[PDB]
Design a protein around this ligand. Structure first.
Ligand SMILES: O=P(O)(O)OP(=O)(O)OP(=O)(O)OC[C@H]1O[C@@H](n2cnc3c(O)ncnc32)[C@H](O)[C@@H]1O
Ligand SMILES: O=P(O)(O)OP(=O)(O)OP(=O)(O)OC[C@H]1O[C@@H](n2cnc3c(O)ncnc32)[C@H](O)[C@@H]1O
Ligand SMILES: [Mg+2]
Ligand SMILES: [Mg+2]
Lengths: 228, 226
């Protein structure tokens, strides 16, 4: 059974993971692909952080699946302990994802921060979860300096667990670029394939312009190729 | 040979140089002899000079480098902007092994994070630490995102059997905050935290710096390094 499961991870916190989910969901929806988006661990609710609500905003996705939510804008382990709550178990995240899986569906799973952040006790990360559900990983990266060492460390940690890499996406592309933010994209595109570079402030594009942005941002052929 | 530590970090601008200077300053006050190698320096046009920072703050005189690049980019893009090549793998490794003598603490600073291209073709500080059989001291932040970056760097080290000498928080803020103090406890759960240097230590003069560094590390560990 199953369709296509992609963890959408990142070189760090705040790199565009959520806008990239919403852009790839949008492009896949416009290709006729059914799309589910899953955020198993959500911190920062007491300041209004809601990555599922944002994905439904920008892309209209309705199949939005959550699990654990914590008020403080901290790492999940710290946020949960600050609230007196536990992290979810590994099999609770896996079940949440497996229930969404469906032939012909693209299910996108957003972690918390970067690849090795602890999501379930003890020390269970998005990479473990990717292993359990046989998912490949989209890696959201910046163009700022530091992006190369963080990307390489991230690709290395995936391959050490045989989690396949589906490419990279630049979460915020400034118009026009600069010498580092050009040599980086050139250096990034030498490390792996840049599936998209979402214009800066895509997160503020209204429903209309986001749909158009997303369709151009991604190679319509690559998208449709992710799911039979 | 003596003791060789590569002093790496989770990223750019995390305080690797001030930590070199701080550990060199503690080691000297423990009667240890210290050398620092910085094979590739970039950003010389705006006047970046990591080895001179160590000279001033800690009084090291054995300060070795191989290449200087004007543009403030990573080594590879700095070398390519200038139309000239990075040094070669053999030069860097041999410079350090020649620096290494018995009784000496020799610290090596790359550029940015562990896996940035340091020599040609695409050789990293990790490859250099393999060749010279160095351990790695890992300079980190206490900000959001440090646990992921730290775990990513520590796994990369261990994949090539380069031993982790410990963590050092390069800048400890005043006052900590909820995130920074939470991160400090969690970092300590994944490796030894040898020091957390106060924010602004790199601006101190040599006497203040030597006093801060003497208090920042544990005497026994420093004394045991060599
Ligand atoms: O938003 P954070 O806390 O970084 O959590 P995250 O790890 O899930 O973040 P992403 O990789 O998905 O990157 C995109 C999000 O960064 C958020 N963000 C961006 N700029 C911000 C700012 O100045 N202040 C607070 N949050 C911001 C913004 O809400 C994006 O949806
Ligand atoms: O100094 P950079 O360019 O970051 O390259 P690096 O790889 O050698 O960086 P380090 O980890 O060695 O140490 C952090 C540096 O950030 C420096 N820095 C300190 N205050 C700064 C400020 O206001 N603005 C920009 N950089 C600053 C600081 O002096 C350190 O040299
Ligand atoms: Mg997000
Ligand atoms: Mg430095």
């Amino acid at each position: 059974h199953g369709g296509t499961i992609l963890v959408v991870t990142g070189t760090g916190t705040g790199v565009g993971k959520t806008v990239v989910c919403a852009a790839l969901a949008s492009a896949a929806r416009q290709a006729g692909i059914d799309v589910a988006v899953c955020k198993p661990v959500q911190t920062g609710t007491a300041r209004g952080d809601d990555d599922l609500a944002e994905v439904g905003r920008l892309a209209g996705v309705t199949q939005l699946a959550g699990l654990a939510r914590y008020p403080q804008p901290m790492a999940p382990a710290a946020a949960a302990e600050h609230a007196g709550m536990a992290l979810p178990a590994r099999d609770q995240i896996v079940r949440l994802i497996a229930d969404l899986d469906r032939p012909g569906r693209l299910t996108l799973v957003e972690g918390a921060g970067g690849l090795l952040v602890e999501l379930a006790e003890p020390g269970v990360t998005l990479r473990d979860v990717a292993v359990d559900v046989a998912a490949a990983a989209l890696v959201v990266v910046t163009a700022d300096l530091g992006t190369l060492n963080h990307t390489k460390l991230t690709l290395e940690a995936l391959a050490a667990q045989q989690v396949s890499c589906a490419g990279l996406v630049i979460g915020s592309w400034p118009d026009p670029p600069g010498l580092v933010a050009a040599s980086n994209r050139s250096a990034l595109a030498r490390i792996a394939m840049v599936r998209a570079a979402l214009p800066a402030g895509a997160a503020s594009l209204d429903a209309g312009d986001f749909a158009a942005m997303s369709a151009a941002a991604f190679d319509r052929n690559w998208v449709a190729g992710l799911v039979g």
